[PDB]
Design a protein around this ligand. Sequence first.
Ligand SMILES: *[C@@H]1O[C@H](CO)[C@@H](O[C@@H]2O[C@H](CO)[C@@H](O[C@@H]3O[C@H](CO[C@H]4O[C@H](CO)[C@@H](O)[C@H](O)[C@@H]4O)[C@@H](O)[C@H](O[C@H]4O[C@H](CO)[C@@H](O)[C@H](O)[C@@H]4O)[C@@H]3O)[C@H](O)[C@H]2NC(C)=O)[C@H](O)[C@H]1NC(C)=O
Ligand SMILES: *[C@@H]1O[C@H](CO)[C@@H](O[C@@H]2O[C@H](CO)[C@@H](O[C@@H]3O[C@H](CO)[C@@H](O)[C@H](O[C@H]4O[C@H](CO)[C@@H](O)[C@H](O)[C@@H]4O)[C@@H]3O)[C@H](O)[C@H]2NC(C)=O)[C@H](O)[C@H]1NC(C)=O
Ligand SMILES: *[C@@H]1O[C@H](CO)[C@@H](O[C@@H]2O[C@H](CO)[C@@H](O[C@@H]3O[C@H](CO[C@H]4O[C@H](CO)[C@@H](O)[C@H](O)[C@@H]4O)[C@@H](O)[C@H](O)[C@@H]3O)[C@H](O)[C@H]2NC(C)=O)[C@H](O)[C@H]1NC(C)=O
Ligand SMILES: *[C@@H]1O[C@H](CO)[C@@H](O[C@@H]2O[C@H](CO)[C@@H](O[C@@H]3O[C@H](CO[C@H]4O[C@H](CO)[C@@H](O)[C@H](O)[C@@H]4O)[C@@H](O)[C@H](O)[C@@H]3O)[C@H](O)[C@H]2NC(C)=O)[C@H](O)[C@H]1NC(C)=O
Ligand SMILES: *[C@@H]1O[C@H](CO)[C@@H](O[C@@H]2O[C@H](CO)[C@@H](O)[C@H](O)[C@H]2NC(C)=O)[C@H](O)[C@H]1NC(C)=O
Ligand SMILES: *[C@@H]1O[C@H](CO)[C@@H](O[C@@H]2O[C@H](CO)[C@@H](O)[C@H](O)[C@H]2NC(C)=O)[C@H](O)[C@H]1NC(C)=O
Ligand SMILES: Cc1cc(-c2ccnc3cc(Cl)ccc23)ccc1O
Ligand SMILES: Cc1cc(-c2ccnc3cc(Cl)ccc23)ccc1O
Ligand SMILES: *[C@@H]1O[C@H](CO)[C@@H](O)[C@H](O)[C@H]1NC(C)=O
Ligand SMILES: *[C@@H]1O[C@H](CO)[C@@H](O)[C@H](O)[C@H]1NC(C)=O
Ligand SMILES: *[C@@H]1O[C@H](CO)[C@@H](O)[C@H](O)[C@H]1NC(C)=O
Ligand SMILES: *[C@@H]1O[C@H](CO)[C@@H](O)[C@H](O)[C@H]1NC(C)=O
Lengths: 743, 738
Amino acid sequence: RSYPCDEKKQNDSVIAECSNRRLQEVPQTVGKYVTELDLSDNFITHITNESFQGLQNLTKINLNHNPNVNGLNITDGAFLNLKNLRELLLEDNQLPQIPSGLPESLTELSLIQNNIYNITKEGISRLINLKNLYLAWNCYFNKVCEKTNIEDGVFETLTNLELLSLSFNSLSHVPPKLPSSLRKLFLSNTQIKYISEEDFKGLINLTLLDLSGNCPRCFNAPFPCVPCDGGASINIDRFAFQNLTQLRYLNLSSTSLRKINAAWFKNMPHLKVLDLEFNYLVGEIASGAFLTMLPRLEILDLSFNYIKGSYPQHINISRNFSKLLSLRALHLRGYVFQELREDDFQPLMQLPNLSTINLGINFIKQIDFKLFQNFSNLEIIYLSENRISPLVDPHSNFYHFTRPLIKPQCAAYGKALDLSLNSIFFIGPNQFENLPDIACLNLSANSNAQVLSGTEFSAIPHVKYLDLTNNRLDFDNASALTELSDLEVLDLSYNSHYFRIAGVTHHLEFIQNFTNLKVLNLSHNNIYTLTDKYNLESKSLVELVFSGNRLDILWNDDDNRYISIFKGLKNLTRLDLSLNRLKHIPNEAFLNLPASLTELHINDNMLKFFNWTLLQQFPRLELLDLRGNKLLFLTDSLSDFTSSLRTLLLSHNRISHLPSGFLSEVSSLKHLDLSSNLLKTINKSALTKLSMLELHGNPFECTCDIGDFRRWMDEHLNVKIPRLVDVICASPGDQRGKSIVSL
Amino acid sequence: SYPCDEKDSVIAECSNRRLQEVPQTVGKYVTELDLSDNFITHITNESFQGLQNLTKINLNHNPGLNITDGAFLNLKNLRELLLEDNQLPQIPSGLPESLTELSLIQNNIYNITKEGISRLINLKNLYLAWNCYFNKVCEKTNIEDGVFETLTNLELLSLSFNSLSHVPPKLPSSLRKLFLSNTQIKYISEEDFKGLINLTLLDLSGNCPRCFNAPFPCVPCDGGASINIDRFAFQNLTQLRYLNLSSTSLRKINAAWFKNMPHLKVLDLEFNYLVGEIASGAFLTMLPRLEILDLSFNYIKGSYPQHINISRNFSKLLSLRALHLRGYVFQELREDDFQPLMQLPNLSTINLGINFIKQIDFKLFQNFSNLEIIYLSENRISPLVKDTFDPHSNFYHFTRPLIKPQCAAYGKALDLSLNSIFFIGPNQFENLPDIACLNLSANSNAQVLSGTEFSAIPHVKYLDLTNNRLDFDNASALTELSDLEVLDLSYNSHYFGVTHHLEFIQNFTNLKVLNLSHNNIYTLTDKYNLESKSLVELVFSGNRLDILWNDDDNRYISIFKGLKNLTRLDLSLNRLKHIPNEAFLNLPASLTELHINDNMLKFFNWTLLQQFPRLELLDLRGNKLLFLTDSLSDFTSSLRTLLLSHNRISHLPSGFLSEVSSLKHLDLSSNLLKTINKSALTKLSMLELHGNPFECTCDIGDFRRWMDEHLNVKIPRLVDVICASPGDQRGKSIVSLE
Ligand SMILES: *[C@@H]1O[C@H](CO)[C@@H](O[C@@H]2O[C@H](CO)[C@@H](O[C@@H]3O[C@H](CO[C@H]4O[C@H](CO)[C@@H](O)[C@H](O)[C@@H]4O)[C@@H](O)[C@H](O[C@H]4O[C@H](CO)[C@@H](O)[C@H](O)[C@@H]4O)[C@@H]3O)[C@H](O)[C@H]2NC(C)=O)[C@H](O)[C@H]1NC(C)=O
Ligand SMILES: *[C@@H]1O[C@H](CO)[C@@H](O[C@@H]2O[C@H](CO)[C@@H](O[C@@H]3O[C@H](CO)[C@@H](O)[C@H](O[C@H]4O[C@H](CO)[C@@H](O)[C@H](O)[C@@H]4O)[C@@H]3O)[C@H](O)[C@H]2NC(C)=O)[C@H](O)[C@H]1NC(C)=O
Ligand SMILES: *[C@@H]1O[C@H](CO)[C@@H](O[C@@H]2O[C@H](CO)[C@@H](O[C@@H]3O[C@H](CO[C@H]4O[C@H](CO)[C@@H](O)[C@H](O)[C@@H]4O)[C@@H](O)[C@H](O)[C@@H]3O)[C@H](O)[C@H]2NC(C)=O)[C@H](O)[C@H]1NC(C)=O
Ligand SMILES: *[C@@H]1O[C@H](CO)[C@@H](O[C@@H]2O[C@H](CO)[C@@H](O[C@@H]3O[C@H](CO[C@H]4O[C@H](CO)[C@@H](O)[C@H](O)[C@@H]4O)[C@@H](O)[C@H](O)[C@@H]3O)[C@H](O)[C@H]2NC(C)=O)[C@H](O)[C@H]1NC(C)=O
Ligand SMILES: *[C@@H]1O[C@H](CO)[C@@H](O[C@@H]2O[C@H](CO)[C@@H](O)[C@H](O)[C@H]2NC(C)=O)[C@H](O)[C@H]1NC(C)=O
Ligand SMILES: *[C@@H]1O[C@H](CO)[C@@H](O[C@@H]2O[C@H](CO)[C@@H](O)[C@H](O)[C@H]2NC(C)=O)[C@H](O)[C@H]1NC(C)=O
Ligand SMILES: Cc1cc(-c2ccnc3cc(Cl)ccc23)ccc1O
Ligand SMILES: Cc1cc(-c2ccnc3cc(Cl)ccc23)ccc1O
Ligand SMILES: *[C@@H]1O[C@H](CO)[C@@H](O)[C@H](O)[C@H]1NC(C)=O
Ligand SMILES: *[C@@H]1O[C@H](CO)[C@@H](O)[C@H](O)[C@H]1NC(C)=O
Ligand SMILES: *[C@@H]1O[C@H](CO)[C@@H](O)[C@H](O)[C@H]1NC(C)=O
Ligand SMILES: *[C@@H]1O[C@H](CO)[C@@H](O)[C@H](O)[C@H]1NC(C)=O
């Protein structure tokens, strides 16, 4: 049972996770099998060559973010002793120089987020084995350095280096004498404004070059941002990329480009991905000679090139876009225009493999929707934040938004259409005319107040994942959404009436009509009364999310009206009743929770009482989540009540005592969470296939009655007890603040 | 006193004290007993023995309630009895004839018997709303023939939210205000409102309602049928000021209805079907004295027409003060469409909210000589780039001011919140009247403020830009509005770790109030101070002072140091663990009021308050403070209001109150006191101790006596000043012991 680290198997070797653990030195209590040690995000101040003796087998050390709340003192030669150290991470250590005397065995080295202004032969030219060197965020609006000093030739002895990052450093010019072995060179945000024919000569293996953020489009710029003198673009020579025949990824985002020279791409037959955002390329997009040089481009990003001051009627697409045969995905966010006609997109209609058109953030008023019918492979039409009306971390892509445009779970069903954040205030009769067969539709946040009658989706009848969240939809009618007989996922989260005065009544009869509806999300609808029918009914449904509603009212109704709301959900396995303000649940109401349940969530309510006997009604229940409540006690024999429960979550409650023979002999129960409660000790009498037990944030009384518990922690090494550091003695005050393991 | 808080009359507040019976510990004086929101179950005639000079009793919201025969009869000076939310089956028998106002709202009273109320001849104001509705039970409210005709001094009768089906016969001529909203009447005969010549207000709303997209359950009349109202219904109603026909599903309005009614002042037609009537509008000629007209939410379902068709007969509305046209829904507003309103000499509010209007020929608001309030929220104006629940509430009318008073007070106010102005167009404000108060809130507006955008309306004094994505890192930003006094930039952030440059503030000659809450400000470029000689209030909540002041090179020790006229600073929600001692001392010594609440403060240097000689109010709530001096007097003598709610203070000196003198309000609620010392015990007027784990034996009784000794020092919420230890005591009020 490791301390303070969490050791464990990783593939075919053993790993010590020792982070966010307030340590002030390296531990010497580390397992002897460990080959990779993460000590990051801690209060460690000094490293000497003593700090990692008896761990010669180490391969990977991470000392990132040390310390938290001067710098990190690394005594020269501190690691030379580690003959198998391949990867060494030293980010955010406030270093003032590359550590002296680093071990030749290294292959990956990160020195990001330091105050290293000097790249010497003294520091790195001895590491002939480096593949991956990362030096970014080292001189970035640091008043000293005025400029990064790159000792000449420092890099040429690195004859096996494949990755060099120097982004967010003031370099003014490209370092000379870079090794032939490079495949990826990152020079983003380096105030490199001119690029010569010499700069990238002898890099015949380059697959990636990043020159983004030089001559920034510093307008609309979140961060500190010095645009070049005038409005000037980065200046890239005519033959700058001539010997770069392997280039696959080129990023020229935010280089203020107005024109694009087609000659840059004459010897680049494999360019796969080209980022051109935050530039001024509206003219170029209309003509675009360079589009003829890119038959293999798979991703083009031209987002946010809009002209300041302008909201022009139409977009203008070069016919040359048709010369983009390999194109998978086009990103045109924030060009900004009013009307999209069938004709404007003719070039793209032939491109065989085009699956993503991203047209977010253009404030487009009208789209001639029939155009999308002419694409044999659209999977993702993304029109968020437009104005359609009704019809009648330094390791992150800094400039191109990387997360999925549309949730996987939605997109997975088929064609995806995202009309979130438009002006669709009611669903017009012609709203979805001429649309291809949409499987996944997003109307979220349209101030949309439709009274659903079963006729509004008929033109796209096969939607399977509908997201309607954050509108004002009236689904009082029991015919509502029935025209979509294949619907599998409906999200009504955050739907209210166009007033948010309380008191709104709901009719939920439409639910029963669906024959393969699987997941329904009624969260935050502030549901306190159902009118006429008082039960939910569906043979299909599997998941119901009832969070953020007033079950509290519903279930204390004088007349027992809703004692059976969720019983007629006959196949349900997952029910979330969190955030419903519950103090006490009517024993009758709980016994009508449908017995098909596997996962019940009642967390974040105000329960003082929970009747454990009722879990006999639930022979297939595996996960009970009761966190964030006020409960005071537990049954003294849980095994009696259920023998199917695997996971029980009691963190953030008021429980002070663990009953005798409680854990004995539930057996069923693998994971039990008791953290953040009021336990002071754990009795000899309370002392199973339990494989994890959470106890952090409980005020303990060490010493001495606690000793029982300890020898239990030693004879049961199988019972993993996470987060030991945060299992803290409350008292006596001489122990206070210690782990209960310190003794 | 206990348990009532008691203060030409005398009011005992016994609201919300979890009382289970009418206290007998009630000062004989008391003429107003408020017992609402409690656990009271029975009211016998024992309950108000020797409380014989009571004027008013509230018993609302208890807890149904078992009130005995003639239980209130004893009380000869009782005028006002409120009995709302008491689950009563029937009106109480034996109510005192002295009553002048009764309320029986939210009960189960399905029968209006003479037995119950006909002997209450001094009644002036009767309320029986919300009793029979949405329940089986009763099928209909049984109202005894002639029950009201003996209440000849009755002025207001409210039966709203009951099922009546027809208006009650035999109503007393003295009625001035009859309320019949949501009562299920669908026809109004000539005879129903007969002889009621003193009526100033009639409410018939929710009768044949416009149900579809109504919040609460709602039932349109069979078919699409409106309420049917005889031609003459209102013939002998010449005195009416208020007519409420909201949600009556009206298509056609009979101008004859208003022949005899030349003083109607407020007409409400929200939630009807009157797009046709707004167009023709014969009834509009019968309203010379009308001041507030409301045609809101009459949109035709399906439709989103180009234009709004406004009858010329709108110009026969010479007394109109405020017109409400929300939810009409139309794409474009032409200058020509609002001609009829341009000669109305006293029109000051046009309300066009929630119409989804794409365009507005703005120059049209120049031909109106009294417009103070143009409210255009939730429309779709775009950047311009070209030259030329509670019973007693109003269900259908938006009661609250359309624009914050503080803004409108400066003059002509334009609200364009929740529109589509993503950047400020070059001609955005051309052809506007001289505008003092502007709301541009919630427009996804990403404009780069360069000091030229606002020049067409340069006399703006109040400007609201909250919930946008503005860039004001240029020092010229907004400086074209030299008369600017209030500027709100709360919840502005970059669209996607953003620098801020806050030099623009300094340029303003006359800027009173700057709000930058929730701007996640962690760094300032170039200049590290904020400078101004005008600014009186800065709000800096929801920013990252914690970063700026844990700054390794001390660049921000004097951020606010230069706001020389500052009296109110708000550093709430700044995640401040610690304040650097000197940085604290560099807060404008002009301060009257300092808020450092809802941070994470473990220590607070109580000495640095000698430096703040004007300080009246200090707010430290919701932190982690472990202790306090002990000698507050030494450190300041101006402090009137100290707020310590929600800290970890376990000791209370003991040199506190001996002597601070200056202090009028000390708030120690939700701390960790176990007791108040004997050494711990000259004027102060409110003390807040509830929420502490008090140790209830056998001291402190000294505090118990010190409460008796010092009666002046009001302590609120006694009932929640709770013994944590030891059960027995656990859960009792410290005033109960011996
Ligand atoms: C309305 O309510 C619905 C239904 O609850 C919500 O939609 C669900 O949202 C949840 C989370 O909010 C989703 O659950 C997550 O699915 C992710 C995708 O999993 C894929 O890969 C995994 C692993 O390889 C497979 O098991 C899986 O089948 C998928 O192939 C997971 O990445 C998430 O992981 C969770 O656990 C891990 C630990 O294992 C943690 O790191 C995470 O924190 C996390 O909890 C998770 O399981 C679910 O997929 C959604 N379903 C649907 C149908 O959309 C909506 O969010 C809600 N609406 C609103 C407005 O809130
Ligand atoms: C200019 O464009 C180029 C692309 O042409 C772009 O380069 C990309 O940089 C990102 C960010 O560094 C890389 O993505 C990472 O790849 C590394 C190695 O595979 C991973 O370590 C990263 O994963 C970490 O972070 C992830 C979340 O971001 C986590 O999932 C995970 O836990 C990791 O901790 C991440 O996957 C990417 O490899 C390159 N692209 C290529 C082809 O090499 C560059 O960023 C752009 N420049 C700027 C300033 O935007
Ligand atoms: C139909 O339209 C009618 C036209 O207004 C609505 O009648 C109004 O109903 C509301 C809700 O109950 C009443 O609100 C009450 O007003 C009185 C006011 O008393 C005085 O004191 C205040 C103090 O400042 C002052 O502002 C006023 O001018 C008064 O002189 C209060 O006792 C209540 O707290 C509450 O504010 C309106 O008073 C009433 N108007 C009139 C003229 O009687 C009616 O609500 C509409 N129907 C529906 C269903 O909404
Ligand atoms: C950004 O910061 C602004 C400045 O703090 C916020 O504006 C202030 O908002 C508060 C409420 O948060 C207002 O204070 C209230 O005003 C009312 C009005 O009282 C009336 O009667 C009193 C009698 O003394 C008179 O003095 C007033 O002038 C009014 O006639 C009070 O009744 C309340 O109790 C309370 O004091 C401020 O007035 C208001 N200031 C301004 C300039 O508007 C603003 O809300 C913040 N913005 C955001 C988005 O959070
Ligand atoms: C529908 O569109 C909305 C609006 O963009 C998406 O909501 C975002 O969801 C992501 C990931 O779930 C959140 O981190 C953001 O907070 C949301 N943004 C906003 C503005 O609310 C939503 O995910 C979309 N639905 C689907 C199925 O993809
Ligand atoms: C500008 O318009 C916004 C949007 O309507 C107003 O925001 C409201 O502010 C009040 C009180 O501060 C809140 O109770 C409401 O919830 C807000 N509404 C919304 C939709 O956010 C704001 O009051 C307006 N500003 C001025 C100066 O009048
Ligand atoms: C992507 C995007 C672009 C713009 C925008 C469009 C046109 N002209 C501008 C001028 C200025 Cl000074 C600032 C922004 C704009 C506004 C909002 C937005 O979300
Ligand atoms: C004022 C307002 C009006 C509308 C609206 C307009 C036109 N036709 C409709 C048809 C239906 Cl079923 C529902 C709503 C409408 C929607 C939202 C809103 O706030
Ligand atoms: C399109 O995708 C297929 C499947 O991967 C690929 O084999 C094909 O070569 C691609 N077509 C073009 C024109 O690049
Ligand atoms: C219920 O859904 C579960 C999936 O959770 C599935 O295994 C079972 O077949 C379904 N049965 C019915 C009748 O829907
Ligand atoms: C707990 O449930 C059992 C039925 O399993 C019932 O007899 C008992 O009344 C319940 N306990 C409480 C306190 O309601
Ligand atoms: C400072 O504020 C006070 C108090 O409102 C005001 O009287 C004075 O005129 C202000 N100073 C300036 C320079 O405007």
